[PDB]
Design an enzyme around this catalytic site. Structure first.
Site, PDB file in Angstrom:
ATOM      1  N   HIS C  99       0.789  -1.231   0.000  1.00 15.99           N
ATOM      2  CA  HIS C  99       0.000   0.000   0.000  1.00 15.99           C
ATOM      3  C   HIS C  99       0.822   1.283   0.000  1.00 15.99           C
ATOM      4  O   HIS C  99       0.241   2.351  -0.212  1.00 15.99           O
ATOM      5  CB  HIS C  99      -0.929   0.017   1.211  1.00 15.99           C
ATOM      6  CG  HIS C  99      -2.186  -0.765   1.022  1.00 15.99           C
ATOM      7  ND1 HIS C  99      -2.975  -1.156   2.083  1.00 15.99           N
ATOM      8  CD2 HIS C  99      -2.833  -1.164  -0.098  1.00 15.99           C
ATOM      9  CE1 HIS C  99      -4.036  -1.788   1.625  1.00 15.99           C
ATOM     10  NE2 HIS C  99      -3.971  -1.820   0.306  1.00 15.99           N
ATOM     11  N   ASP C 122      -9.949  -2.641   2.384  1.00 21.57           N
ATOM     12  CA  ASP C 122      -8.813  -3.089   3.167  1.00 21.57           C
ATOM     13  C   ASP C 122      -9.321  -3.460   4.549  1.00 21.57           C
ATOM     14  O   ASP C 122     -10.312  -2.906   5.026  1.00 21.57           O
ATOM     15  CB  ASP C 122      -7.746  -1.989   3.242  1.00 21.57           C
ATOM     16  CG  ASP C 122      -6.478  -2.408   3.988  1.00 21.57           C
ATOM     17  OD1 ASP C 122      -6.318  -3.575   4.379  1.00 21.57           O
ATOM     18  OD2 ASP C 122      -5.644  -1.526   4.243  1.00 21.57           O
ATOM     19  N   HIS C 124      -7.660  -2.652   7.070  1.00 18.66           N
ATOM     20  CA  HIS C 124      -7.189  -1.548   7.877  1.00 18.66           C
ATOM     21  C   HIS C 124      -7.485  -0.258   7.129  1.00 18.66           C
ATOM     22  O   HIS C 124      -7.712  -0.262   5.923  1.00 18.66           O
ATOM     23  CB  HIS C 124      -5.691  -1.710   8.126  1.00 18.66           C
ATOM     24  CG  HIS C 124      -5.305  -3.111   8.479  1.00 18.66           C
ATOM     25  ND1 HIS C 124      -4.862  -4.012   7.538  1.00 18.66           N
ATOM     26  CD2 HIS C 124      -5.356  -3.784   9.650  1.00 18.66           C
ATOM     27  CE1 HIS C 124      -4.616  -5.170   8.123  1.00 18.66           C
ATOM     28  NE2 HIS C 124      -4.908  -5.059   9.405  1.00 18.66           N
ATOM     29  N   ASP C 126      -5.288   2.159   6.964  1.00 17.88           N
ATOM     30  CA  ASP C 126      -3.966   2.620   6.546  1.00 17.88           C
ATOM     31  C   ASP C 126      -3.886   4.142   6.501  1.00 17.88           C
ATOM     32  O   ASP C 126      -3.444   4.733   5.516  1.00 17.88           O
ATOM     33  CB  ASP C 126      -3.547   2.016   5.206  1.00 17.88           C
ATOM     34  CG  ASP C 126      -3.253   0.543   5.303  1.00 17.88           C
ATOM     35  OD1 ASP C 126      -3.001   0.065   6.428  1.00 17.88           O
ATOM     36  OD2 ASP C 126      -3.212  -0.122   4.250  1.00 17.88           O
ATOM     37  N   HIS C 139       3.518   0.765   4.617  1.00 17.33           N
ATOM     38  CA  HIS C 139       2.403   0.044   4.017  1.00 17.33           C
ATOM     39  C   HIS C 139       1.089   0.359   4.707  1.00 17.33           C
ATOM     40  O   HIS C 139       0.052  -0.177   4.306  1.00 17.33           O
ATOM     41  CB  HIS C 139       2.623  -1.459   4.063  1.00 17.33           C
ATOM     42  CG  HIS C 139       2.378  -2.063   5.411  1.00 17.33           C
ATOM     43  ND1 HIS C 139       1.164  -2.615   5.767  1.00 17.33           N
ATOM     44  CD2 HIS C 139       3.182  -2.189   6.494  1.00 17.33           C
ATOM     45  CE1 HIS C 139       1.233  -3.061   7.008  1.00 17.33           C
ATOM     46  NE2 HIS C 139       2.448  -2.819   7.471  1.00 17.33           N
ATOM     47  N   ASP C 230      -6.984  -4.032  -1.203  1.00 15.05           N
ATOM     48  CA  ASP C 230      -6.095  -4.937  -0.502  1.00 15.05           C
ATOM     49  C   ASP C 230      -6.655  -6.344  -0.608  1.00 15.05           C
ATOM     50  O   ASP C 230      -7.864  -6.545  -0.731  1.00 15.05           O
ATOM     51  CB  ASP C 230      -5.944  -4.515   0.960  1.00 15.05           C
ATOM     52  CG  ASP C 230      -4.765  -5.182   1.663  1.00 15.05           C
ATOM     53  OD1 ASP C 230      -4.276  -6.227   1.198  1.00 15.05           O
ATOM     54  OD2 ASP C 230      -4.270  -4.621   2.663  1.00 15.05           O
ATOM     55  N   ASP C 232      -5.876  -8.551   1.846  1.00 18.79           N
ATOM     56  CA  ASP C 232      -6.190  -9.038   3.174  1.00 18.79           C
ATOM     57  C   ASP C 232      -7.558  -8.564   3.637  1.00 18.79           C
ATOM     58  O   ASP C 232      -7.989  -8.948   4.722  1.00 18.79           O
ATOM     59  CB  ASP C 232      -5.072  -8.686   4.192  1.00 18.79           C
ATOM     60  CG  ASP C 232      -4.968  -7.189   4.571  1.00 18.79           C
ATOM     61  OD1 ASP C 232      -5.809  -6.342   4.261  1.00 18.79           O
ATOM     62  OD2 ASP C 232      -3.957  -6.849   5.224  1.00 18.79           O
ATOM     63  N   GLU C 275      -0.454  -6.051  -1.571  1.00 22.72           N
ATOM     64  CA  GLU C 275      -0.213  -6.956  -0.444  1.00 22.72           C
ATOM     65  C   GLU C 275      -0.304  -8.431  -0.813  1.00 22.72           C
ATOM     66  O   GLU C 275      -0.485  -9.278   0.068  1.00 22.72           O
ATOM     67  CB  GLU C 275      -1.160  -6.672   0.722  1.00 22.72           C
ATOM     68  CG  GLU C 275      -1.008  -5.315   1.361  1.00 22.72           C
ATOM     69  CD  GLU C 275       0.277  -5.189   2.137  1.00 22.72           C
ATOM     70  OE1 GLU C 275       0.746  -6.211   2.677  1.00 22.72           O
ATOM     71  OE2 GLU C 275       0.812  -4.066   2.216  1.00 22.72           O
TER      72      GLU C 275
HETATM   73 MN   LIG Z   1      -4.696  -4.351   5.008  1.00 28.16          MN
END
Ligand SMILES: [Mn+2]
Ligand SMILES: [Mn+2]
Ligand SMILES: [Mn+2]
Lengths: 317, 214, 317, 214, 317
Positions: C99, C122, C124, C126, C139, C230, C232, C275
């Site tokens: 990221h 995502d 998160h 971020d 990231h 992302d 994840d 990622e």
């Molecule tokens: Mn993430």
């Protein structure tokens, strides 16, 4: 009662699909105890035995369609047996096998109720033609024989002389499509078939999808419903032991849900459990998850609802 | 693990008539298997695709049948380029087993082996080894057992037998009785013996030598 | 057409994230055949090659931020390359990596269309700052450099001189957040960013969530959409071969769905697949599921829709 | 010649629980086969008559099933008198083949072999022979390979391995490495070696002697 | 025409007889080309496939009768199939197998024509009872279930609930008996069954025997004839590949003759070819003679007469 009155028809047939091993379809579903897992709730279970599938040795191929006459003889035999068990007033539990059998499974169901509907829960539409497929495998051409709007355009492939197309293009709903070859989607768009793929499944939510599916079939008029159900239409995290696994299927929750909405109409009148294959699980644990999935799907069809099932006596006694 | 059993293990038929071969299943494969042409050290090319029907670059004579337990591979117009280890192979059950081996030899008039026995060199004895090998040559058919003896008392754990294919021209066979000893075991004994035994050999062909005779 | 016109930018960069191995990101996605799996439908695919990432040997750390200048040089280079491929009229398929690259991936996209939107799918947010993180790993700080409402408050961390914050806090929607450190959620609540976490995803349903997300971004005015995605953000049952796996992500079905809603606006204008890490799968089967997931996500972005994709000729011929 | 295959080749289960055994057919024998109790050197008495139903002097615990390809022999109440080589045997196809062997051993804690190596006697040397045999003793399970060497260089064609049954009391096993040489070959060498190898032996158990040492 | 209109029913069943291997009965008779050797003369041949014989695993024995329920289920299934092919207007060619199947083969034939006759050409009478046999093998008790004069005396052996005795003791003729156990001959003498054993065969001559046999069955009234034919009734010089070979049987000439007299009445209405066993020939040449014998017997039943068979056009043209 009216519902949960079951005629089981095991149909160990394979020659529509290429991966041999689906003929241990009814054997594994019966040894997983589908009969006895029906018998807790008020399931009038009458096993009618397995159908004999004779072997035509010179089942010579068509241009692309291969093993045609064995498929046509099997589906004609199954059409007679489905018409028999629907004259018995039961709900036809026809489990194989492969989707080649669904020709006679919808045909003999239409021989009693000509104005039914088909909820074809499958990863694929299975509506290729004998002319415009590229496989020629009859585990993906049952629906093209059955639509009256396709008449005069289907070849006279041998074994299919008895085949009368019996259902209307506006009387079928696909739920859970996720891999379609181009011929099938032109048929899907030109006939104006209503369908809820995994796009539309996620769009409305699975409940609004089943709401609009019952609003499409039963919103006009109450009529018998024929859930023909593939087990690859669920995600291969739950059923990897199938013939054609495609990732991105329905969650096992939602598969059980679609069956439970068909139950709570009280209008379930025909059931197909196809493409179960214990020979393709990489571990027997994969096979165990797949078969327990398909068993509990069949349970939640006939009213093993997840809310509960009862017998009407007081239990505080 | 359905076992596929090929009923002709070996085959030796002249350039000529039908060479019908057999392959059996332990279940019903049901017209779902094939036939191959493994030349030695080559690509085991397809002969017959689905128990019949002769795939895509097949010459003229490779019909076959089945459906569904014990199948046939007919080589009607034998064509002596076709001398290869043949394989049936079931397909539509996992895991997908094979046949055993169908070595199609050349049928000819039974040749007698030319047999004699050979010492270790002084160049070997300066290295410190012993390799007493007997050398068998130009026979038909394949099967020879060769015995060794320590001046009359038999030998193993050095003894190795290794055979080629059948020859192109005279169409014969092959064996060395590849035996290895030590220089110490070499020097303690003289009369080293090689006892061949072929079908053409009515008596077992014994050829010998003393150490320090040649 | 307008959509499914693709410029691929592989960006094997790692130094924003600590787990080295994500630099086999574009290599594994290309050897899984993302190019050829685009080329069935009408995908104008033009590979622009991978970007060279030079190694600053004395990339000396900040207070908490570590490897800053390599990240800033990589994102400046990527901002130039994204501006190049958006001047080519294509949809920027920028796949890494991590990221950290999304700084320049949103920046060069804003250099052509300054009024875009960001769907940052995502686990998160971020959006840590250089001052109030506790990692200092870039990231997870791309979004803090990009919001104009955070200007005058972001440090002059080296490598980030070129960074102009280019998107508004009311012009970004997070979908699928499931693990947020406290600084990022104060930024999230004070800016009034609209977001649908896995709470709100489950609340509305993923379809009503994408409905309100498109009603938030495109309901005011049609504008370009930049899905930065992302891998994840999906559940680690589908992608365990990621850098920071957090359980409870989106189902693979719904990830494909979010991409398909962005396609059926016809307004997809920038795509990030970050990622992906083949080095962290405990089995290669885990890596295989992860990479096939991310490939089919990228397919359903550019209109490999699960409903079907076609070429407009008659196929009954 | 339908081949009957017994899937448990060997068996070692303690006095205790079920000892379900397997026997498979190459065709459909279809509930037409039996089960036997061949004690060593005895009458292979019938256990189960027609894939079930427990014939006429059977104790209590010898149920079994089949019908019709892969059959079962259940020994539920194991009863340690029953330690015998068991046989399924198909019947209703000619010729009437048998199974392979189902040696039901005793399961116990793995015993280590007591291994040493023994020369030829002077009473033998007055007769003119050499018989250097190593003697292996009280181990579990059965499998040991023993190597010999001519002062470091290996030996065969005299070497014979022979095993008893499992013992009644301590329930162990057996081998002599029965090797025979000549008196001349005896006198030319000293350091005669016996290399045992058992599962309990992490290192291969070497026991040796020189000639004219003992 | 009326005659030589054939419905073939293969019935690979063994559990009436002990020597397993007769289930390659229809397989060897079909691979010897019985179908195509019918098709030269005007034989309307319609193969109905083989019957499935399910395996009752706990087919627990009676006092003496062993494997009873498999025999009874097989003969009930065959009775339904024989009634089916006699409602097709054809001549039932039911070939197995063993004489256990002849229960349903005569029963379903009587379901259409209740006043038929049985020419039981066999070395044995096969009329032991469940009580007074010493074998208990149901390849020799079909006739005791079928005679109405034996009712109230046959036990209710399981699998035989459907069994109605359907033929009269004065409506059956044995031809070629040569080994009878004492119970069967007391039944034979007390019922007054007409029979021509090999004594009476040699006494009258085989032609005067068939003359008086047709004078006994058809001399009163024209009625359907059911030749149920064992292949051990011939001498084992011609058929050694049978289950129970007894020396002194009919010559192969006379077996063909008995079939040809049944043809030239024009009243052949049911045919059984039982006890063919390719597994008991000591050489395959013995099997080859046995199977070619039984094939040509079946040919001379349906009018492959040794005098000649023709199609009615001029052949000098
Ligand atoms: Mn993430
Ligand atoms: Mn499917
Ligand atoms: Mn008889």
């Amino acid at each position: 009662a009216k519902s949960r009155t079951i005629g089981i028809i095991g149909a160990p047939f394979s020659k529509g699909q290429p991966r041999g091993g689906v003929e241990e379809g009814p054997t594994v579903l019966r040894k997983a105890g589908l009969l006895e897992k029906l018998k807790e709730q008020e399931c009038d279970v009458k096993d009618y035995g397995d159908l004999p599938f004779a072997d035509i040795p010179n089942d010579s191929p068509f241009q692309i369609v291969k093993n045609p006459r064995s498929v046509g003889k099997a589906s004609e035999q199954l059409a007679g047996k489905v018409a028999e068990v629907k004259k018995n007033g039961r709900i036809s539990l026809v489990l194989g096998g492969d989707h080649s059998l669904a020709i006679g499974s919808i045909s003999g169901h239409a021989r009693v109720h000509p104005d039914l509907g088909v909820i074809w829960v499958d990863a694929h539409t299975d509506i290729n033609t004998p002319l415009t497929t590229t496989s020629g495998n009859l585990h993906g051409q049952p629906v093209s024989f059955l639509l009256k709007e396709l008449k005069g355009k289907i070849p006279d492939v041998p074994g299919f002389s008895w085949v009368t197309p019996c259902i209307s293009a506006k009387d079928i709903v696909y739920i859970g499509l996720r891999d379609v070859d181009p011929g099938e989607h032109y048929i899907l768009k030109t006939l104006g078939i209503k369908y809820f793929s995994m796009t539309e499944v996620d769009r409305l939510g699975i409940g609004k999808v089943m709401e609009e599916t019952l609003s499409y079939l039963l919103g006009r008029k109450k009529r018998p419903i024929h859930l023909s159900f593939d087990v690859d239409g669920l995600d291969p995290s739950f059923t990897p032991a199938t013939g054609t696994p495609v990732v991105g299927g329905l969650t096992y929750r939602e598969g059980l849900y679609i069956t439970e909405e068909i139950y709570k109409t009280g209008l379930l009148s025909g059931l197909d459990i196809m493409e179960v294959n214990p020979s393709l699980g990489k571990t027997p644990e994969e096979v165990t998850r797949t078969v327990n999935t398909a068993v509990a799907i069949t349970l939640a069809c006939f009213g093993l609802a997840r809310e509960g099932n009862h017998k009407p006596i007081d239990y505080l006694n | 693990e359905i076992v596929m059993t090929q009923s002709p293990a070996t085959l030796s038929l002249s350039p000529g008539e039908r060479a019908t071969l057999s392959c059996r299943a332990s279940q019903s494969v049901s017209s779902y298997l094939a036939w191959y042409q493994q030349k030695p050290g080559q690509a085991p090319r397809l002969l017959i695709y689905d128990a019949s029907n002769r795939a895509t670059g097949i010459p003229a004579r490779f019909s076959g049948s089945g459906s569904g337990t014990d199948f046939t591979l007919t080589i009607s117009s034998l064509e002596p380029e076709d001398f290869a280890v043949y394989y049936c192979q079931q397909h539509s059950l996992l895991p997908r087993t094979f046949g055993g081996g169908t070595k199609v030899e050349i049928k000819r008039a039974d040749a007698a082996p030319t047999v004699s026995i050979f010492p270790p060199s002084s160049e070997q004895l300066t290295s410190g080894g012993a390799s007493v090998v007997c050398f068998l040559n130009n026979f038909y058919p394949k099967d020879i057992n060769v015995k060794w003896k320590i001046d009359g008392s038999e030998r193993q754990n050095g003894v190795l037998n290794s055979w080629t294919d059948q020859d192109s021209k005279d169409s014969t066979y092959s064996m060395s009785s590849t035996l290895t000893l030590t220089k110490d075991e070499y020097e303690r004994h003289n009369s080293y013996t090689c006892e061949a035994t072929h079908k053409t050999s009515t008596s077992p062909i014994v050829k010998s030598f003393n150490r320090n005779e040649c």
